[model samples]
Target: NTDIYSKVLVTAIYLALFVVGTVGNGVTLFTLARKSLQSRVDYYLGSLALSDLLILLFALPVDLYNFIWVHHPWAFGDAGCKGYYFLREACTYATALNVVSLSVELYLAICHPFKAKTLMSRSRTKKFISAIWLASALLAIPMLFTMGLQNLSGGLVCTPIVDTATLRVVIQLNTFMSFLFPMLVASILNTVAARRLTVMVHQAAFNMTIEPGRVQALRRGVLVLRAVVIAFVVCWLPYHVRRLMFVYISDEQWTTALFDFYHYFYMLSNALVYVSAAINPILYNLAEDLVEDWEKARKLLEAARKGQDDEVRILLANGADVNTADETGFTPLHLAAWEGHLGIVEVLLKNGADVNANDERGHTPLHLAAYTGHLEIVEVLLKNGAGVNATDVIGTAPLHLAAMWGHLEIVEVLLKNGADVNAQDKFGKTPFDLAIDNGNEDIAEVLQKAATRELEVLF
Candidate 1:
């Protein structure tokens, strides 16, 4: 009686959820497709879009049709009876895995970015989504046999093929796999990431010229990450509660009052699971883009670049991020070093600028200094532990850059500081090759001497 009205409300909820999520997830995938996969975040975001779409497209429709519209005979035939729940169950695991991995990705990127540079490399992340899908697909294999058409008293229904006691064990186990464990890890990672964000709040990226869409590069960008973690629990916790209630409180015990409550609460949680599938796209991109809008961290980088020493000091005094890079990946230290502002570089390093921070071009502060003939800034960076042998995007090192630009003295200084003599570019040309090709005869002579020294050491 009351259940039919409840179903009416749920049907509308599913309809709205299905329509809205279909468009939302689709637009998300489209947006990600249009943009190049620049960061590890992009790879995970795209994977998340696909994962969410799988549920909204495949899982929602079957569930809505079978549970709400047709209560009697299973219309999807044997194929769906066998594969439908199997598919849905796999997607449920995928969603859990995706959410957990997404949280972990944010934690690694935000809290420990120094290590994350190696650990969260985009190539590794590109393949991780496939592994997530595979794990879920393999885990849900049992559901293939467990869910199928069942012969009722006089009719047929799509129901589990397993006996009651066995399924209870499976449900309890699956609840942990798809919900409990992931939720636990997400909590730990999300909290740590948030804690780190607070530490970095007064520390970095506030670009004055940052466009609306680009400020998402800041640490504050983790707003979406935290939001996603919260959204996962909020959306799925009720579903688990509903499952736990059914598993523990059985009909044989005649637990009427609690059972009644469970029955009523089922529709609400059911609607929430639908909500969960759609909320991620909204939580991921737009939230970050909007938050980055008001960021003033870019001012620090601009001041450092413009040789405005007083302004740079003022911003740092105001609690600007000394190490935060702009959307272009240029840190304040990077700009200051390239522009030959040793005073500003000194101030930035004192405040906590990363000497080894690389720009989007893979040019570290050392690279920028070497390329621009800033010998004093280069010496300062080396003293502060700037990695001498660090390569740019194309495998061009600081020494190669210095040699190519005919910074004859800076080249010698770099060589004396133990910069690699034989480091090759993507084209396999060493520093001497760059010096010779660029017609820097004096640089070529120095580079030749270093290589000959290295050759003698090898012998």
Candidate 2:
């Protein structure tokens, strides 16, 4: 009765996973294809869908057959057995690696945006995807060698043909590669990314007022990344743990009832692993909807310029690109400084704004700040590692701009922060020259004194 019940329950779960996984992954593939892969994240989404679909297509039928018809022989013969097991192992490896790959891509995009552009290039992403499939294929070759048909009085069953000595080693290797390594890698990377994301989101929210749409999107994106990692761990851990336990435990130590219970639990856990593949598309689909729009970004820039501190914070928290620029290459930071909003400038800087970002005319935020005589903003830029001597389009440094504008306070600040008072612009005019040309006697005097002090040190 116990054996009969296990078979029926296992069959029900297998068929359910088969139907659900196929439909879910199929829709995912269709959606991803229709969307047209734009970013590395999209590429990962497509790859994940493909991985799940392949498992559903090639692996699940064999699994269903084994679960429902355990008393009958694997009538597919040796080649079929090898192929079936190979497909199962290979697809599982592909799924694991694909999840790991996606986790890594998310980490790069979120925590290291500067490097993400270069590292997550379309060609490189394709190469990594291909490498993952090829590696899984090679690993599954061992499965073909180890698995074959074993004849019993009742029927011929497909099982591992390797001796016990080698069986333990192979099982351990499969468990590590398919479950442990991927889980560990995803956990570590996602944890760090989550922590950084939390601080960024909170800092942005604390500084500004956010819209409902942006808040929902930001929260949803973070939630999906975390959900993916947790889902992978939950689905795969139990299956691998059960397999490891079965390998060590003696069958005789269990009576018929106990062994049946063990087998039932094993099947249920393994079914849940397949369910992970099915549920991946749903989680990723949730992620894709939180994608971006430029209008929202433009609003962020507008808010920064208007000194709408709460709006700026909310926009950033809702996923506004901090480095987004207009046609003239001026970012929100540029506008914020130009408008003399020190609070906005600080908020932008704290939320990972680029300090030395140059505009179309090659003016940095520091250049705009100094040119407009925002001494406090200049101080903020300098404190955040803005290059004191950074040149803009026409080779005008912040010091040259400050001196050119005859802003005595900004000139003093720039000179103190290692801005070369003697640095020449495109037309070869030094800060002192600019000050003198502009007839700012106090600024010129300050630059000349700094130059004299430098000369004295050199002598």
Candidate 3:
């Protein structure tokens, strides 16, 4: 029989989660609402935060209270029996559905807002919320009237009793409706939101009123949402999915420990959600500093905004880290080349953006420009001491990428830049070799000329 140690452990976790989750969600609601134009984005968050708070306040507490009484005999008889069990079941459904609803709603609100707007409006959101309440009530109705507190044959003890099939169905349905759908929604939204925010960061220094701070805030929010959504999905989803799959498709052969472990993780993942909520505030504060820096830089660059070169010069003069690499290890030069921003590329090179700075895939700015046929930018890089023979992780030089694509102009520029015509990629195929292999006769002819010239010049 489980004792107070187990009960207290469960209670302690719930108590901690409630206190922290409530405070964090409350503060977020306050801050986001005050941001004046926080986007309908904030409203979606409000729904999510509210759901988490409900779990912390109503759902978590009840679960812990029940755990404490699990070891002992039933203190509340007959009337207490039906009502308590019913309330628990109802609250469980509500909490589960709340999470799912919040996730799905927030996902559409953030990720697919254009499509979602056509479908889900404020009136629709209200209707959806109302439907959740009704569905939860109906689902929990079984536990209320049909449930009873009873003892085992050995007189060990137990809480509300139900058969394995009934228990499985009840728990699995709740998890699917609440956790699986919602988490999938939130994760997709957050991923898109993260990408949107990231793209805006490089477009303009002073595009937004809050400039860089809000961008930073948006970035942090994106990461947190990703972590939170993934945590919730992993912790709770597999158990329910596997439960249903195993029951219906007995060939699955899941172990008892699998169910036991997932159940434990489901509860534990809630605590993780509670803990991750703290990161938003900390990230916001840090982003506040970044915002200030962005604003200052913007003010200084305002006079030179028309000239990409001048703007870059102002940024570098003001101690901006021009060579700074982002999450993908791409420098500003790489982005400029990729985006075909020749003026920006010239400015970055003049202001010390590393021409040879390789990204995660080891492709230099020149390699990127070559692949994309950014001929003008490629010329600028060549003139500014960009390495002509630089090979990436795959050992493919700019010449190889250019030849394969039959980018005639880029091939000429690379050849003129003194690229090694016979250099091979990891597959040991030189530019000439790859062109011939692909039946690119025109490109192969150009490469043959360049390769023969290279051998003659070097010899």
Q: Which candidate is the best by TM-score?
A: 2
On residues 396-435, what C-alpha lDDT tens digit does candidate 1 reach at each position?
A: 9988888879998899888888888878789999999988
Candidates' C-alpha lDDT = 0.76, 0.78, 0.61
- Evaluated at residue 80, the lDDT of candidate 3 is 59
Per-residue C-alpha lDDT of model 2 across residues 234-326, encoded as one tens digit per residue? 888887777777766644577777676776777778788778888877877676655654446768878988999999999899878787766
The per-prediction CA RMSD against the true structure, in angstroms, equals 14.4, 11.0, 13.3
What tens-digit string does per-residue lDDT give for candidate 3 at 89-131?
4544554554455445545545564686587666566666677
Ranking 2 against 3 by TM-score, winner: 2
| Number of the candidate with higher lDDT, 1 or 2 | 2
How many steric clashes does model 2 contain? Answer: 5
Provide the global lDDT of candidate 1 against the true structure. 0.76
Stretches of candidate 2 exceeding 4 Å from the true structure: 1-6, 36-38, 202-220, 250-253, 292-459
As a TM-score, model 2 comes out at 0.63
